Design a protein around this nucleic acid. Structure first.
Lengths: 99, 111, 97, 76, 80, 98, 83, 109, 96
DNA sequence: TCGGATGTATATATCTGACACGTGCCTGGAGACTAGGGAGTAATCCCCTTGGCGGTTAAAACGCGGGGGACAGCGCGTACGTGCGTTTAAGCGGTGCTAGAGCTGTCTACGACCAATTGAGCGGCCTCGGCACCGGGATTCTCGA
DNA sequence: TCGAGAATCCCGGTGCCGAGGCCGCTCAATTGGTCGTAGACAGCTCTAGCACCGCTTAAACGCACGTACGCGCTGTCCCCCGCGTTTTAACCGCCAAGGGGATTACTCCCTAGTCTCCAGGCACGTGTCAGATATATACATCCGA
């Protein structure tokens, strides 16, 4: 019979592996395309240095990781294990970002 | 009329950071009309102390993992494990830093 | 070929590193991070001292303003040790000439 | 017991203390016999840095031990 | 140009896994995409304002750092 | 026989009344004594201006009101009506305070 | 004269009134001590900054301007008391 | 001979003092030199913002059938407008109070 | 034996108030609040303009610095209306 | 499903302290003129940005079985809200007194500014050792019986 | 409780590129001297902050009672997780063209500095009405029935 792990083991393994390392997690080209499309609205025919795109990517990733940590704490506070959109909304509301 | 050999102002105070550069930056930085003769020495000493402390901690972290060079991960580990330094750099992100290895206790496997 | 000079704190940071840990190198990214850290702290302290001097309607920046700004910015133990180091440095500079 | 401590200058010096001797009195005696201030130096035994309030009995340092001595240059 | 769809589901999963999450519901992805869009909008608006004032045509790495610092989100190691 | 209100009515009445007004809630003299005792630890034989005490009281009251609002939101999020210390702890943790 | 045991001057009904203004409806019996601790910490921070400010000026009377500056330094600016 | 004096504020058609703003800019340690166009711009911006806040506060005061303006009216005016609330998000107003809201769950059945 | 002079923004605030609502007064505490508000906004704008001038290796602050600082600080509609008012005022001043 | 008791909103007299206004005057703002350096503008150089083409291989997309977690319903007992009688000190109105904030002179030591000059720090080259990579074996776990 | 598979770590050999050090030189920090004024010190005047004493009454305290809500337990259903197969586009390498960033020289004009003059804004004093209290009454709302 095929050997299967119980649901939950691979999640913890991925947690350990991914917070042991220090690389980026989003593919570079789609992020660059998104940045260009977002900036197109404000001014036409713009140009970007590579280091600017790198800095934007790093800042966005750090922000998202911190927000996800806060969301996990909010989810645990209510005797649950799965995160849900209401947890994200509550975290953003308490942080003072959402009006 | 024989001018004496020049001696750096940093050497008189027994420091390593440049006193004269800091004095010029203070004068040209639009902070006040005039700048006293004792502020640059104080500023240089303070900056030197902070740099030495952070470097010592980061070097210890690097030696821990059997390496002879310092990389941004070692700086992040050094900063985030000390409460006072963590308080100082509360709202600062370091590139290529990562995060501390923690897991919530409830999520751990039962039995 | 004409190139503009750029100033940095690299050599002094390397001197301090060799002073505390005799056998340890450093890469370029860490040096850039340290440069940014030094510049940021310098700006914070200088701005606080300037505001403090402006409050008391005085037109000079002395060591007293720097001491008060350092005591205001840093946490406890760091403030104590930094104040001690600064006072020692000023005394040593004044004694020699 | 007797210990041998090598410095950054490549020189090794003998040292006579007891297992329960804390690093404070050992540093004071080394200062007496060499003139080196206690707070200017720091020692490694087996890749571990000593603690001033600790001794060699808990640190497991015995006779004919090899310790590494490294300068901590600080002051004004 | 639906480039917002370039943020694949496994990438969001990896970010959450580094954040410390063990189980993820099925509707997190839309919220994550919206939040990321808002953040990028604000930062890029500030950076483009700086670049336009400087009388240039290409954004630099410096004004990105300036815009990030303006919002109390200082960044180290990019020539700041 | 005596007329009694069911548990909950007076709470809402007080909510409305205290959200309609603006006056201070903590008494003056106990707050002044607390401020003096706290400040004693930094420099002996200090003196205060009355406006300083008033400013401290206003700032502290505003801070406490905001904290209680966030605490109530946290308590509501977990299917409860009564607030508990862990709600205060979670709100303070998320806000970014040690 | 040395003062002692003044944290108990913040009575339970005062905390209840503050919570009522905040919008709470039911309060557990363990809130009051936690509220006292939080208020104590906040006051310690603000008073420390104000006393430093008044010390630099070689004075001996804490003025409202010192409190205003100390509050502003922490991003909690206050309007209506000058400056 | 000499001509009669006219204020710069009168020339610009404003109600805020241009000369005082110019002096404060010069003496505030902001830059080495100050141009001749900055004070007019700054005075205009300040006047516009003051007029906006005052109009909203006066409307709120007239709502409560009163002839004068007290800090509560200013707080009500500021907190009920989105952009003004965002501009003053970290500012507390003395004698202000709060906005009368109650969560829907706590209401009786 | 008279006291020293304390500057304030009293007359101008009162003039604007009478311009908007002609039949409405104001009390003292609200007046102090408005004074503090004006000072705070002035300081914020001036500091932003000074930093912007410093970044570009320039040694003077002109109307362009003020305009860019206003655009950076304020939210959208307030920024647009303030920009329009400022440019109109500057043009009217230069014309005469 | 109605009806009595309680709290809250509405209308009127009245008296007090704060707001609005009139004066004198003195210091800050305006008019007129010079002189000098910061900034606008044109021309030139070349570095870095954009755009295109081929492959290759790892990563993303899709389908499926199933076990574990989210959620609704029930029962219990205890902590909290409401009301009443008793105790405590906060608040207000005076009377004293002095420590210290605030303003004025004056006088000297400290910082800005200038000309000559020489050594610290930056840009360009290069060489080699520390770290990245690949293959293999020992070890440490997890899940079913 | 015990043992068969997977995933991870320790070890050894190999090669590459950037980190550490050396030269040459140009600009900025030193040294020596003068001059003007910012602030430190002494003296004086007057305010408001601290201390005390008495009285009134409103708020804090303690107790009894009942009830609605926090929390544990059970059952069900469905929806994410782990795995295998197919598809796709990201990444790397290489090659071309040229737009716009970065210097350098030249010149006109915008702003700081000075002197004279005068009127706008601030401290001071005075009056009167907007609103805060007190009293009475009408109306909305809640809890048993």
């Amino acid at each position: 019979k095929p050997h299967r792990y119980r649901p939950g083991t691979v999640a913890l393994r991925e947690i350990r592996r991914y917070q042991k390392s220090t690389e980026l997690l989003i593919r570079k080209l789609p992020f660059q395309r998104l940045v260009r499309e977002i900036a197109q609205d404000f001014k036409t025919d713009l140009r970007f240095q590579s280091s600017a795109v790198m800095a934007l990517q790093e800042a966005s990733e750090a922000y998202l990781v911190a927000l996800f940590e806060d969301t996990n704490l909010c989810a645990i506070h209510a005797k649950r294990v799965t995160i849900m959109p209401k947890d994200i909304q509550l975290a953003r509301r308490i942080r003072g970002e959402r009006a | 009329k024989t001018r004496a050999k020049a001696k750096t102002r940093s050497s008189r105070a027994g420091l390593q950071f440049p006193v004269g550069r800091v004095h010029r930056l203070l004068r040209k930085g639009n902070y006040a009309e005039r700048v006293g003769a004792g502020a640059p020495v104080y500023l240089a000493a303070v900056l030197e102390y902070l740099t030495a402390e952070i470097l010592e901690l980061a070097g210890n972290a690097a030696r821990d993992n059997k390496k002879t060079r310092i990389i941004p991960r070692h700086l992040q580990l050094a900063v985030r494990n000390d409460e006072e330094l963590n308080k100082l750099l509360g709202r600062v992100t370091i590139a290529q830093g990562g995060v501390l290895p923690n897991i919530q206790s409830v999520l751990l496997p039962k039995k | 070929r004409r190139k503009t000079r750029k100033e940095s704190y690299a050599i002094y940071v390397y001197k301090v590193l060799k002073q505390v840990h005799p056998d340890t190198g450093i890469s370029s990214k860490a040096m850039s991070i340290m440069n940014s850290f030094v510049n940021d702290v310098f700006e914070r302290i200088a701005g606080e001292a300037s505001r403090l001097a402006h409050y008391n309607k005085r037109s000079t920046i002395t060591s007293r303003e720097i001491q008060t700004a350092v005591r205001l910015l840093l946490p406890g133990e760091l403030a104590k040790h930094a104040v001690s180091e600064g006072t020692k440095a000023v005394t040593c500079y004044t004694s020699a000439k | 017991m007797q210990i041998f401590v090598k410095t950054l200058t490549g020189k090794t010096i003998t040292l006579e203390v007891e297992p329960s001797d804390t690093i404070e009195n050992v540093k004071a005696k080394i200062q007496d016999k060499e003139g080196i201030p206690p707070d200017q130096q720091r020692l490694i035994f087996a890749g571990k840095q000593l603690e001033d309030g600790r001794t060699l009995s808990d640190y497991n340092i015995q006779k004919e031990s090899t310790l590494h001595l490294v300068l901590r240059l600080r002051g004004c | 140009r639906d480039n917002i769809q370039g943020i694949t589901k496994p990438a969001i999963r990896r970010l959450a896994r580094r954040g410390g999450v063990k189980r993820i519901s099925g509707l997190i992805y839309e919220e994550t995409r919206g939040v990321l869009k808002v953040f990028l909008e604000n930062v890029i608006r500030d950076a483009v304002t700086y670049t336009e004032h400087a009388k240039r045509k290409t954004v630099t790495a410096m004004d990105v750092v300036y815009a990030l610092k303006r919002q109390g989100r200082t960044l180290y190691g990019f020539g700041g």
